[PDB]
């Protein structure tokens, strides 16, 4: 097949980051954490404090205008997440409708790679067995 120049892919991934030092104002972090009901966690033998459902950061993003960023955060992505995690805390994510890059507003900025992780690892007190569950996705701020 006709192969493409790899530089274009590199430009798509790293290109935006290279423009960071040229910026004048600081960045603002974001993420689209997905919730996790405590029932299934306890049912799987996990020891967790507090009733509120746990949530896990799937992917972090960056902006700089808080105003429009908040104005764009009200969209409800039509892509569910199929979270799976083993007892060894090896955590995995899957989007039942695939998440396309063009759906990301072009004012955002994504890291080249990212690793899913608990937003607050201290909530859990003991890893029970392996766990799977489904939840919606919601862009949110962070501090």
């Amino acid at each position: 097949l006709a192969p493409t120049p790899a530089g274009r892919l590199y430009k798509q991934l790293f290109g935006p980051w290279l423009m960071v030092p040229r910026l004048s104002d600081p960045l603002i972090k974001l993420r689209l954490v997905a919730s996790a009901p405590a029932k299934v966690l306890r049912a799987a033998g996990w020891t967790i404090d507090g009733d509120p459902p746990l949530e896990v950061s799937c992917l972090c993003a960056y902006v700089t205008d808080r105003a429009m960023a908040a104005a764009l955060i009200e969209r409800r992505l039509d892509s569910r997440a199929l979270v799976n995690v083993g007892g060894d805390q090896l955590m995995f994510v899957e989007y039942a409708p695939p998440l396309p890059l063009v759906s990301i507003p072009r004012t955002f900025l994504l890291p080249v790679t990212y690793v899913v992780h608990w937003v607050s690892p201290q909530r859990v007190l003991l890893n029970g067995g392996n766990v799977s569950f489904t939840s919606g996705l919601e862009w949110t701020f962070d501090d």
Binding site: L1, A2, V40, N84, P98, V102, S132, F133
Partner: protein
């Protein structure tokens, strides 16, 4: 027979009626039907107590050894797999486990149970592993039991009822009473023994019960436990018992089948065990019959006419058989016995072989034996977890033994690479072939014709469909806001729905959506793995158009598609018969998995390059199907790269190659498993319907041709083989369709090729396929397997096991159907028993019993009322089931070939005429004023007393509920309509044509006063038909059901005493039967197994007429005037209207308006209209104008010549002159001939000459009334 005494009184009456003791009546018809619906099914098993079995069968207790299910399932990567027990990775089927522990109790029937609500909740909510595994196991186990047209116990009840009493003999000299008898059938005795385990207080609890939502199970007491395999074993036993009786086989063969099933059931994975040793029976019998010394008999002499492309064959006598003609290939005993040793079933082989050795000569007995033994293979629709199925089939990639080196390609053309001229070999052959075809496609003004463009777009829409969700996502992703029409109650996933959304959008905007996910489906099979259905979205289907077009040209212009025109499927019948004759040697071949072996790295890349290059000849700037030309960079020259325009066709290829290289991305969402949907890509070609047969057949033919002409001569060793291998070409030596293929050798001069050379030849072919990764899976056994048809020495062998009496596929956890549909199931069920030649007398008896049970049904509102109804038995007569005994007649005088519909009614009445008239005169007072056909004797009242009218009109009533409309939804209906019309009428010329035609038509029809309200086929109604189909595909609301029951009952209760106008007129004709026609062939020669003097009527019908369709002058009317039409409209409606107009003598402009109403331009409309004439029309072509058609059952017989010159519509010395048709005979005689032959085919026995003897009214009066009716409709 004490069993007859055991039956309740209504069933005893029904059995008497079925035996022919008494004429059937609605009264007993209801009593039997009602009582079956009220008594518990276990009583059917209870009946078995009264059979003193005397068969040597023992049911080992090894069956009740449930293997724990917990070790047969696991979840990894969040999907529930099957984790096979044996090291074989294919043991992915239902295990042998005790379902008991997973059961609760029902409140309605406390004895039986269903799944724990706790388990399903936890699997749903908590996604608990063991909960999910249990759920998945329960779902599939239930589904496997559900693969039946109805509950097996009911079928067993049918068999006992018919077999409870011997049928009364008819007066026919060939009416042999049944040789087989009960108390000798191993199957029934086996059922008795195994069922002894399931009784606690002489109650005989059924191991399972099928329901609309699947199947339920009975909670075992603490001592016992129920293994799911037992239920499957019962179904196989019941099915075998029924089949053995109908086929009338020796008990010894049935004994072997019982042992066969028992051994399979004893081990784990009953399905897998059966699947492994599947082909044992055909190999033992069909593949090795005449490998001995005392060979001989008579065989057909079939000749293939010179224009072999036409596939025309001639029967030209018989040939004496002798030892020099006996089959040459080695027998199959050794491998089969070796396999059977594994399952210690060598006794079965010894029994079969010994019995086979009793048929050294080819005759009726030999083939009958072959038919019976081959009918022993299991008829179960096997089903496995779809997840395992998709994971096991698409995980295969072809292995190429000599890949195309990367240095064999030119520079890229943006996506594709052209093939260097210096490269030779099969790939070069393939490249040139596709390139040449692409060139021919390139310049072809056949396309860009707006009508043809309409055909292609319309071809893409059907009621079914898929991948709509992927479509909506992908376009929404690219910012495209599609319309919605939900209020118009039509399924979104329907291909119609997505098509309507697309109508407005500029096509190029949609290009990004072709790289989207495709959903999938699975359809189970009887003797193999389940098939796959992979429906592309409408856009993808549109893009792949060039691939289809080129493939079609390759097929239609090289080997004439090898019958893939599929015009009538019966054209393969004479072909295989000829291929199996002694003078010819035939080899059966088929690609191991053509869908899985076609791929981009080797195959598709070559095709894409050839097509892209082949399209270079043509205007570089010429949009095709809305795809404009574009600029692409050419890099063939490293020193002088540049960019040049390419035509739309090439742009399509550019994207198509990109998609193929990326590989198809499927998304599985199986419902039987629990919460395990996912997506994974594969190179497997979709191959979901006939649209794939074209590509595979083209490549199939190409590789075969290169092998024959180039590879084999250069590589084979035997000089004699070279001598015979040469002078051979595919166009007269090879045919195929998809993977399947047939290769036949040139007639070796009064001799046969050495098996040594055959082995050399077959070996080289295997290696040749291995080169590019095709496993050829060839075999040589001097038999004909093509499209699942079997022929031996010119005699067709119906493989009955592929049509199990009880089995039926169901691809969903729920049956999702309503009661009246069962009737159509019965009708279709009965026809198979006619197509396959069974014992026609006994098959008819069983059929009526099935009908009686189906005749009654009911329904309940989701919360409110119940509803009920049942048909008078005369309905089934109208639907096409012969009556067994009429009052005043003798039983079993009506042949199964009796046509359905009005024709069957007319023929029955015609024979029944005199008795009715005389009897009515004695019984009833005369009617008040004279009748055309009847005297004053008033038979109509008698018919009403028989409820004939009730049945006649009841069968006319529809059987599926109708969905309701709405006005805001009608805005969506209009929106749906508008867009469908918009999609249909891409241009404006077609819209102008149709509008003009419609306007002229109604103007003419009213002003000329032909009639008003004539629903003439026109394009403006095609979207309406689509909309109705789309709305119909939805699950109806209950109100529609209630309307159906009420309407049906009212139609039943309404007192009417008249048939349709046509049937009323048809009764005016009197037809008589003369002597038998001269025979077609020698009665000694068998042509269809089982159509022998034992099964007399089939044996008569085939012998008199001859099977080979040989319409040398008739052509069976396939020359329809309108060769090119759009989907949705019916050609058979169009020509009927045209002929009707021509008979009515309409002015030419009437034809012009009608033709213009379906898009034909004025010039071609005049051209077509001129062709219309009563002369060139065929008998059936003109007779269809009044819906007189040929029954499907006749499609296997050579009825042409009989209808032509054996059905005398006017014999001078017999007919009354009043019946002389005079000048209108040009269109009257075909009608009379059709009526005559229909009556002749109705009666049993040999075919006799049919003669019109009298019409009560003058023939002129008949013609006049017909013209009136023709004008009315």
């Amino acid at each position: 027979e004490e069993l007859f005494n055991a039956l309740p009184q209504p069933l005893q009456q029904l059995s008497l009626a079925l035996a022919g003791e008494i004429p059937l009546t609605d009264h007993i018809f209801e009593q039997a039907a009602s009582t079956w619906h009220v008594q518990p099914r276990s009583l059917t098993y209870k009946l078995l107590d009264h059979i003193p079995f005397s068969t040597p069968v023992v049911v080992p207790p090894s069956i009740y050894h449930s293997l724990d299910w917990s070790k047969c399932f696991a979840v990894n990567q969040d999907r529930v797999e099957r984790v096979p027990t044996i090291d074989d990775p294919d043991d992915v089927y239902v295990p042998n486990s005790d379902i008991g522990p997973l059961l609760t109790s029902l409140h309605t029937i406390p004895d039986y149970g269903f799944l724990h609500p706790a388990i399903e909740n936890d699997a749903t909510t908590l996604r608990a592993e063991r909960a999910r595994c249990a759920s998945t196991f329960y779902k599939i186990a239930s589904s496997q039991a559900r693969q039946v047209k109805l509950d097996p116990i009911r079928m067993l009840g049918f068999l006992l009822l018919v077999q409870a009493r011997p049928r009364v003999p008819s007066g026919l000299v060939t009416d042999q009473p049944t040789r087989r008898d009960p108390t000798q059938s191993p199957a029934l005795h086996a059922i008795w023994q195994v069922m002894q385990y399931y009784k606690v207080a002489g109650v005989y609890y059924a191991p399972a019960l099928v329901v609309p939502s699947g199947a339920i199970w009975w909670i075992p007491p603490p001592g016992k436990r129920n293994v799911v395999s037992v239920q499957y074993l019962l179904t196989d036993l019941i099915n075998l018992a029924i089949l053995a009786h109908m086929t009338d086989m020796s008990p010894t063969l049935e004994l072997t089948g019982v042992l066969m099933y028992l051994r399979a059931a004893s081990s784990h994975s009953h399905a897998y065990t059966l699947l492994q040793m599947k082909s044992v029976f055909p190999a033992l019998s069909l593949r090795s019959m005449y490998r001995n010394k005392g060979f001989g008999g008579k065989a057909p002499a079939i000749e293939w006419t010179e224009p072999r492309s036409k596939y025309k064959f001639r029967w030209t006598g018989v040939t004496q058989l002798h030892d020099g003609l006996r089959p040459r290939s080695p027998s199959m005993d050794v491998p089969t016995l070796e396999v059977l040793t594994k399952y210690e079933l060598v006794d079965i082989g010894h029994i079969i072989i010994r019995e086979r050795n009793a048929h050294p000569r080819h005759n009726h007995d030999s083939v009958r034996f072959v038919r019976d033994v081959m009918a022993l293979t299991s008829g179960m629709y096997l089903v496995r977890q779809p997840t395992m199925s998709v994971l096991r089939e698409y995980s295969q990639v072809p292995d190429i033994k000599d890949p195309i080196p990367p240095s064999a390609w030119t520079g890229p053309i943006g996506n594709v690479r052209y093939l260097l001229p210096s490269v030779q070999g099969p790939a070069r052959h393939l490249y040139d072939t596709w390139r040449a075809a692409a060139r021919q496609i390139a310049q072809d003004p056949q396309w860009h014709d707006p009508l043809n463009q309409a055909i292609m777009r319309a071809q893409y829409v059907t009621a079914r469909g898929g991948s709509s969700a992927s479509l909506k996502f992908a376009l929404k992703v690219t910012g495209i806001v599609l319309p919605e029409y939900d209020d118009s109650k039509v399924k979104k996933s329907s291909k119609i729905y997505q098509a309507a959304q697309i109508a407005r959008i500029a096509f190029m905007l949609l290009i990004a959506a072709i790289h989207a996910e495709v959903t999938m489906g699975i359809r189970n099979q009887v003797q193999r793995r389940a098939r796959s259905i992979m429906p592309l979205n409408v856009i993808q289907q549109a893009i792949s158009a060039p691939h289809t077009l080129v493939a079609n040209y390759i097929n239609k212009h090289m080997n004439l598609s090898t019958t893939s025109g599929s015009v009538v499927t019966d054209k393969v019948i004479p072909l295989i018969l000829y291929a199996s004759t002694p003078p010819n040697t035939v080899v059966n071949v088929d690609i191991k998995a053509c869908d899985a072996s076609i791929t981009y790295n080797y195959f598709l890349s070559v095709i894409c390059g050839a097509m892209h290059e082949g399209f270079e000849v043509g205007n570089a700037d010429a949009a095709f199907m809305g795809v404009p030309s574009t600029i692409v960079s050419d890099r063939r020259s490293s020193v002088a790269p540049y960019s040049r325009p390419i035509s739309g066709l090439q742009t399509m290829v550019q994207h198509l190659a990109d998609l193929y290289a990326a590989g198809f991305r499927y998304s599985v969402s199986d419902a039987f498993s629990s919460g395990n949907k996912f997506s994974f890509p594969t190179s497997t070609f979709p191959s979901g319907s006939t649209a794939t047969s074209t590509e595979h057949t083209a490549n199939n033919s190409t590789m075969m041709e290169y092998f024959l002409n180039v590879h084999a001569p250069s590589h084979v060793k035997s000089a004699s083989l070279k001598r015979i291998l040469t002078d051979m070409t595919i166009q007269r030596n090879y045919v195929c369709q998809g993977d399947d293929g047939i290769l036949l050798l040139p007639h070796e001069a009064a001799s046969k090729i050495s098996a040594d050379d055959m082995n050399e030849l077959l070996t080289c072919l295997r290696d040749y396929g291995q080169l590019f990764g095709w496993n050829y899976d060839i075999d040589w056994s001097d038999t004909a397997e093509y499209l699942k048809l079997y022929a031996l020495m010119g005699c067709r062998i119906p493989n009955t096991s592929r049509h199990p009496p009880v089995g039926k596929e169901y691809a969903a956890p729920q049956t999702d159907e309503i009661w009246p549909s069962l009737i159509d199931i019965v009708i279709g069920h009965h026809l198979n028993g006619v197509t396959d030649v069974l014992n026609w007398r006994e098959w008819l008896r069983f059929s009526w019993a099935f009908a009686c049970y189906s005749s009654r049904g009911g329904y309940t509102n989701p919360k409110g009322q119940s509803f009920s109804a049942q048909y008078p038995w005369w309905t089934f007569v109208y639907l096409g089931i012969p009556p067994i005994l009429l009052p005043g007649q003798t039983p079993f005088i009506h042949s199964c070939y009796m046509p359905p519909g009005d024709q069957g009614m007319f023929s029955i009445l015609n024979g029944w005429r005199d008795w009715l008239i005389s009897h009515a005169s004695t019984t009833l007072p005369p009617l008040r004023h004279n009748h055309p056909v009847w005297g004053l004797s008033d038979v109509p009242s008698l018919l009403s007393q028989f409820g004939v009218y009730a049945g006649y009109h009841a069968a006319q009533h529809y059987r599926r509920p109708k969905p309701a409309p709405e006005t805001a939804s009608s805005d969506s209906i209009n929106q749906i309509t508008s867009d469908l019309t918009e999609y249909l009428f891409y241009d404006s010329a077609l819209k102008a044509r149709v509008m003009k035609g419609r306007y002229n038509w109604e103007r003419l029809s009213s002003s000329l006063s032909l009639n008003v309200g004539s629903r003439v086929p026109s394009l403006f109604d095609v979207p309406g038909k689509w909309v109705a189909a789309g709305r119909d595909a939805e699950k109806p609301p209950p109100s529609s059901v209630e309307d159906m029951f009420t309407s049906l009952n009212r139609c039943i209760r309404r007192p009417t005493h008249s048939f349709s106008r046509l049937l009323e007129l048809y009764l005016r004709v009197h037809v008589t039967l003369g002597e038998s026609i001269p025979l077609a062939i020698d009665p000694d020669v068998p042509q269809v197994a089982g159509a022998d003097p034992a099964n007399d009527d089939h044996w008569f019908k085939y012998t008199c007429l001859g099977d080979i369709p040989s319409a040398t002058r008739n052509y069976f009317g396939e020359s329809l005037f309108v060769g090119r039409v759009v989907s949705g409209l019916d050609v058979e409606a169009v020509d009927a209207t045209l002929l009707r107009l021509k008979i009515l003598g309409a002015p030419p402009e009437a034809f012009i308006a009608v033709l213009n109403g379906i898009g034909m331009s004025d010039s071609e409309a005049h051209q077509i209209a001129g062709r219309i004439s009563l002369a060139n029309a065929q008998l059936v072509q003109i007779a269809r104008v009044v819906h007189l058609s040929i029954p499907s059952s006749w499609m296997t017989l050579n009825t042409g010549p009989y209808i032509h010159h054996h059905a005398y519509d006017f014999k001078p010395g017999i007919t009354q002159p009043s019946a002389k048709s005079r000048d209108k005979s040009i269109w009257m005689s075909p009608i009379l001939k059709l009526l005559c032959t229909s009556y002749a085919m109705t009666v049993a026995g040999p075919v006799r000459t049919s003669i019109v003897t009298e019409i009560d009214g003058s023939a002129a009066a008949l013609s006049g009334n017909l013209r009136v009716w023709m004008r009315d409709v």
